[PDB]
Design a protein around this ligand. Structure first.
Ligand SMILES: CCCCCCCCCCCCCC(=O)O
Ligand SMILES: CCCCCCCCCCCCCC(=O)O
Ligand SMILES: CCCCCCCCCCCCCC(=O)O
Ligand SMILES: CCCCCCCCCCCCCC(=O)O
Lengths: 242, 52, 240, 278, 193, 240, 278, 240, 52
């Protein structure tokens, strides 16, 4: 026999092993692969697809209505429409989206994200909106004067119903932590703020609905990636399923 | 691969007869994201207005 | 030059719209016939052609203030209609794609948004396993009770992964989707299995420039595409 | 040799993420990349470079940890049958639906074609479930649909002339074996909008695709057990094809053979008191 | 080809289980035989060569043929309809319904035998051999075979008014089996001595 | 080498006979599709293929001592049967030929002769103009009352000008006829007009080598051939 | 190297099932494929394409799971001798007839030429047959016809100077060994229509072909056993030639050395009340 | 041109039949002499030629209403007959094939079907191990008691795997089988081992066009083919 | 074989001296079904009548 020295790690089972193993049915010949539409080779093809933010997460809003941010006729200038901490982890609105639910399976992320907004008011309803991205270091911008100092787009309601604010990868490091784990101070990875402001006002003809909606949508850009698989927090069980 | 950067280069060696015995495949396969992101008859180039 | 104006001609039937957005072709895959390499059933298929590959209009639905949404199984919804319905009744197995056209016009004095989902293999549940009147509702279709969960414990927000369009009343009055056949086998029974579900869910509610709410119907028009049928026997209408 | 070259496949993970080209300011009425139309169903085409002034970035990040192979390519628990001492026999029905983590990972796709590596860890314990010593062979028999099931520890079915079996020791290394894609269909189905039977629309056969079900694993000790044995069954999915991505499961799973959920409070993400502050 | 244990009526024993009765009819379009197309279970196909091989396997694909041999006197005439109905419903109730399927029409004559080829007509590439209830393998229901009088059996005066069909079955060259499994009915309660 | 043995395979259906005479092909004309030079209807026809071009068996008839004969209108007799029947119901106009197979076996101890006529445009009368139950009798067919006059004031003896075979029990047990479409126009309605009549008339009566007369059925099997349909609308079953 | 090339055999399972050619309708008196004559003893020659209108089907299914090698090429139980503590010795007579699954699989053929892989699992237990701990070497000795048999645990026959033996541990991995085709005949015989002896027609020597019998395996522990040991003997048939297929066994087996059956109720498949309904 | 007419000439003997089906050649293997590569016995064989390779007729059997079947072991049945019998008695070992011809004529007024099996290595049992008068019954042959189980715990239905023909009285009056030598060794003793069993089993019973049942015999005619014998000593007739 | 479809391709490597030690053979061998299905002196082509 060939002299050998089995070493440490002998007979262990690692769940991420990449080893060949004997087939219990070595003569089996599977059914052919047929053409099926929509073959996926990499889950970042899904992450680049837009999905709707559960953006209207105010206490008391249930169901489909959590998907429409209110936008109204204002009686005061430069008012705020929306505020959102840029986070792939945690439990805020981004966490339940396609990108957010993929991020639940991963520990680290990098790359640019885009947010596409669609206005749902009547044809006759006009308005201009400021969408701002504030890099980290401080708090959420308090007024439109402070928010405009950051990356921002200005949206004119019109025939083209939707706008994109690209949130570019602006970062001290090549990767950030998905989670906000407190004991581990993963707030170190704070990724900034997204805020929405009235650039002029929502204006309506007499007797029209004085309230309309924005449907926010989010997706990853082609420069985006995830590392380190991890267990999804909110997919649990207390018993074996029967 | 004794290292290029983000290139893992593997020789999968299967010792058993059936292909199903082989370890997991390490190839990166083609990504066609546009069958899901741009699933529309008429292409809309980035610099154009989408409607009309 | 204009993807707001479309015309769809299948068989003896033609649709037009002056406010389309574009046409969604699911997974970039136009419907296509089954090749000899993937086929298993040895009998020569019947291909009915224009007798079945044509637009059929279902009964319209009123968009009400409280509407949660509507859904139709395919081929289920058309299994009792026309020569499509007859070819599906008389054969054991069927394959084909769809051309779906959802119509809803309102005014420049209205607001509201419909989401138009084509969901493949849309198995549904709620707090209970559903009965036949909900799994295969027929031409009249069913209604959502958990539109937030997409009737299936997932979320409506993430259903944009499915092929879709919007009907946003400020922009368009119609949605068009072309659907390839999707299944894990080459052909399958029309009465036992629904390959696609057409789902129309209100996201932004319907609002009018007055408090008097006139009737705003939604209307579904569906054309089978590239159909084949194998296994000819007597006509069987439902899985019951 | 070339014959040994047949048993080696050189396979490479070197696909990179997209880079960034430098851009400058644009003042025009020609190019409007930020104007979109979500009604079409297309995702936004606007990129970084067309929205702000960018620098150049050479791509350096891989994508391989989110390849479908890497995402599924690890072992997960799928079955935990307990062998008691009264009959010294147990079984596990073969599907990936008892334990939620693998099931929820599979819920991202409709159709999935794969092979499986199974790994079985046996553990002996007392009635109060404290670890204990017990050296014994056990037998796992694959019993496919239509093969008679063993009814006792000494049933002559355990002959195993045609059912494949694995024999291993309770206190030895874990049993491990691979399995090809076995469906009569050309893929497995994670979700099924149909009935298991013709001429039947019973709710208990809705959503049941019996081509996903390849039968049973049966378990005995080769002698009568002195202590109870717990088998932990792990599956690693490999050589994986995936089609038709889905909205992933969000509500908790409740039943093994259907998608029933509570749906009492329609929300997923947590609430706040005001949309304009955190 | 092997002989179907086709005359499986309660009370028929021995070699006689191999001959389906065929008689002079006093009514039109009557039924001769009915058989659920199944390689598993315990019906007549299960004891044939193909059926006993299928007992060792879990899955099957391909076309099957059934060859029928008439055993009446030289002077005995008749025409018979042999039908194969793809799945989805029940057994065809009358010859009008059965004829809508795949079918052959058999004229008794010098060439004693006929083949009804039951072609592989199937949503999937393979079916399950068994009809395992807990696992809903009735999903794999493969259809029906029925036999009908196309005209009648006619005899000269005083001849036997009853004759027989010997049914035979075999696989076509496009047929295969997968997944070995234990045979249900080959058991033992003790070690053989 | 043997025109006494025949096999006819159309669709999923196959007929055999070990005592044929030959095959009659009416006017030497195999059924054929309509050419662009003779066609008038501008819509694209539906050609159902094997779903309809297949043998259908009608209910059998007892040959009794007193039998005067039987007749079926085509397409009338098959208008409620299978996918032929459905394609004929759902279209305004139809065209196609027929493959007709009449079966009647008896013994070498029997005698008797059937005449098997395919009569084009067989308008019928008697002492009175006939009602609908006789002009379009359906799948069950009608019976002659004036077999000598061929129900039409002509003579049975001269009806050998029509395409025909005999069933002479000493010789054969089956007759096969292939019929081309015959009409004065390119297509015509299936419910309003019968292009062919299949007529089976006993000429030499049925005699047995005993006085006890067992049951000797006649059985008709008909396959449509080279069918086209134009004018798709709802399904209409009869001209009533 | 070429010398190592001698120890490698590249062997391929790529035989496919037959395909299907498209066909069209046939109206003729020329070709009658459906008319048959079972009297000749030939199976019907009629095919799909000549009976109905077929499409074209490219063959994709393999046949290898029904190759004789694959059908026999797995391990099955063939012997279960029990070593008691009174004498610490047992034996098993070598043939594949104690356990019915392998015997019934072999009954499909008349003559069979093969090699064997034997696998032995030893299990220790108490008098009440509950698994127990016992570490001991055991010895399996091949005793061919005419070699003296051991009569005790300490018999000097276990020297094993000329009989081959395998020594293994009761609580170690299973003993395993291969065996070439050993018959004096050019194949084994599954059935024998003759007598074991000239000048003798005793019923107990009818159907007995002694060229199938290669002798005995004898079993002791190397010390006196403290607990009873059960050896399970598995055989896998390999490198298999098969001739002359048979009607397979249908009645249950009753005796080890003959084909006696009950035959009380002459039927195999189950009954129904009417041939024209299920 | 006609496989219903056959002539078989071996030695000084010739068989004819005007109603054969064909000739079954078992496993497609014509009998053949033993090659030097497979042979083991070193002495020069005796090959008797025409003195033994000729048809021998056994005594006939009446086909009765209750008949379960008949069987003969080979060479057993011919071991006391002619120069075949003498060469088999005087040698230790023997090898050769068979030409088997089963005759049974009846009328066109009869019905009934015989199955004619040549079963290699047909070891028999019932509820008990059989005695010598059944394992080696001689020229008179034995009778089945478990024809359904083929005397061996298998089934008659599956015995079509064995080389066979039918005698279906409406079709043929004779069956012919050519059998190669089959064994697991090159030669073997004629008195100790039976390589083939000729089995004739009624499947459809014998019915007459009257209730008076005349005598219908079955007759077996067997010719050895390509015979060799080794091991010459005194003549030994049986294994007893 | 790291996969063609239904082609298992194996290098059987025997480590011991005797051929009987080698693992099971994976070759598909020739099938002659007609020695059992068409065991008749005169071939009967499918399109012909069998008798006469
Ligand atoms: C027993 C035969 C030895 C052959 C194994 C050689 C080592 C395995 C090759 C590993 C190839 C990828 C390793 C790497 O470069 O990262
Ligand atoms: C023990 C050897 C044969 C066992 C076959 C196991 C194959 C398991 C595949 C399961 C795929 C369906 C998953 C599911 O239904 O949730
Ligand atoms: C232990 C080493 C030598 C043992 C030889 C074992 C060979 C077994 C072959 C058995 C073949 C006959 C089977 C049977 O009679 O049923
Ligand atoms: C210790 C010497 C190492 C030689 C073994 C190399 C791997 C075995 C070859 C397996 C060949 C068939 C595998 C396959 O392609 O499916």
């Amino acid at each position: 026999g060939l002299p050998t020295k089995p070493g440490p790690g002998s007979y262990q089972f690692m769940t991420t092993d990449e080893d060949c193993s004997p087939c219990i049915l070595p003569d089996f010949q599977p059914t052919p692969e047929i053409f099926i539409p929509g073959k996926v080779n990499n889950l970042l093809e899904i992450a680049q697809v837009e999905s709707i933010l559960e953006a209207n997460n105010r206490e008391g809003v249930e169901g489909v209505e959590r998907y429409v941010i209110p936008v109204s006729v204002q009686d005061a200038l430069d008012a705020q429409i929306y505020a959102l901490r840029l986070e792939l982890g945690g439990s805020g609105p981004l966490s339940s989206s396609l990108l957010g639910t993929l991020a639940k399976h991963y520990t680290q992320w990098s790359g640019s994200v885009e947010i596409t907004c669609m206005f749902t008011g009547t044809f006759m309803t006009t308005g201009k909106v400021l969408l701002a991205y504030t890099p980290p270091g401080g708090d959420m911008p308090r007024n439109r004067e402070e928010a405009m100092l950051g990356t921002h787009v200005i949206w004119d309601f019109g025939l083209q119903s939707s706008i994109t604010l690209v949130i570019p990868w602006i970062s001290a490091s090549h990767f950030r932590g998905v989670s906000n784990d407190d004991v581990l101070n993963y707030q170190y990875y704070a990724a900034g703020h997204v805020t929405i402001w009235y650039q002029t006002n929502m204006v309506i003809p007499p007797g029209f609905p004085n309230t309309a909606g924005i449907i926010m949508m989010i997706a990853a850009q082609p420069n985006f990636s995830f590392r380190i698989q991890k267990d999804r927090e909110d997919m649990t069980q207390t018993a074996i399923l029967q | 691969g004794a290292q290029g950067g983000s290139t893992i280069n593997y020789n999968n060696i299967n010792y058993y007869s059936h292909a199903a015995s082989a370890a997991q495949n390490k190839q990166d396969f083609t990504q066609d994201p546009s069958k899901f992101t741009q699933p529309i008859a008429d292409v809309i180039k980035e610099t154009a207005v989408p409607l009309k | 030059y204009s993807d707001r104006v479309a015309q769809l001609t299948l068989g003896n039937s033609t649709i037009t719209t002056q406010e389309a957005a574009n046409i969604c072709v699911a997974y970039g895959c136009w419907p296509a016939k089954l090749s000899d390499t993937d086929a298993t059933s040895v009998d020569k298929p019947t291909e009915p052609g224009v007798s079945a590959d044509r637009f059929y209009t279902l009964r319209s639905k009123p968009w009400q203030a409280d509407s949660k949404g509507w859904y139709w199984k395919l081929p289920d919804a058309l299994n009792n209609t026309g020569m499509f319905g007859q070819n599906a009744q008389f054969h054991y197995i069927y394959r084909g794609g769809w051309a779906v056209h959802v119509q809803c016009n309102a005014t420049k004095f209205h607001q509201g948004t419909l989401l138009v989902l084509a969901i493949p293999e849309h198995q549904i549940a709620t707090q209970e396993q559903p009965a036949f009147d909900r799994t295969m509702p027929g031409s009249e279709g069913g209604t959502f009770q958990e539109p937030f969960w997409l009737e299936d414990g997932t979320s409506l927000g993430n259903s944009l992964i499915y092929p879709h369009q919007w009907i946003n009343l400020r922009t368009n009055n119609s949605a068009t989707l072309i659907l390839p056949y999707v299944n894990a086998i080459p052909m399958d029974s029309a009465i036992r299995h629904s390959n696609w579900t057409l789902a129309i869910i209100p996201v932004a509610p319907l609002k009018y420039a007055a408090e008097t709410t006139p009737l705003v119907p939604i209307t579904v028009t569906i054309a089978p595409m590239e159909t084949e049928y194998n296994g000819l026997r007597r006509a069987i209408a439902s899985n019951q | 040799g070339k014959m040994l070259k047949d048993a080696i496949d050189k396979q490479v993970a070197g696909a990179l993420v997209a880079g960034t080209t430098t851009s400058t300011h644009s003042v025009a009425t020609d190019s409007t990349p930020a104007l979109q139309a979500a009604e079409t169903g297309a995702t936004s085409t606007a990129r970084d470079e067309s929205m702000i002034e960018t620098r150049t970035i050479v791509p350096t990040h891989g994508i391989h940890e989110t390849s479908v192979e890497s995402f599924f390519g690890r072992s997960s628990l799928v079955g935990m049958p307990l062998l008691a001492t009264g009959t010294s026999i147990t079984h596990w029905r073969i599907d990936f639906r008892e334990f939620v983590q693998l099931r929820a990972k599979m819920s991202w796709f409709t159709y999935m074609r794969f092979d499986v590596e199974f790994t079985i860890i046996a553990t002996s314990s007392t009635g109060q479930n404290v670890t204990t010593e017990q050296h014994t062979t056990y037998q796992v028999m694959y019993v496919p649909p239509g093969a008679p099931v063993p009814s006792n520890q000494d049933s002559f079915q355990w002959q195993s002339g045609c059912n494949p079996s694995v024999f291993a020791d309770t206190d030895g290394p874990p049993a491990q074996f691979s399995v090809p894609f076995m469906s009569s269909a050309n893929a497995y189905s994670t979700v099924y909008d149909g009935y298991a039977r013709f001429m039947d629309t019973d709710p208990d056969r809705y959503g049941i695709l019996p081509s996903n079900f390849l039968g049973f694993m049966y378990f005995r000790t080769l002698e009568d057990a002195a202590h109870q044995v717990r088998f932990r069954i792990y599956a690693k999915i490999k050589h994986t094809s995936c089609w038709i991505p889905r909205a992933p499961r969000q509500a908790p799973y409740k039943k093994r053979y259907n998608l029933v959920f509570s749906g009492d409070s329609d929300r997923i993400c947590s609430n706040r008191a005001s949309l304009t502050s955190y």
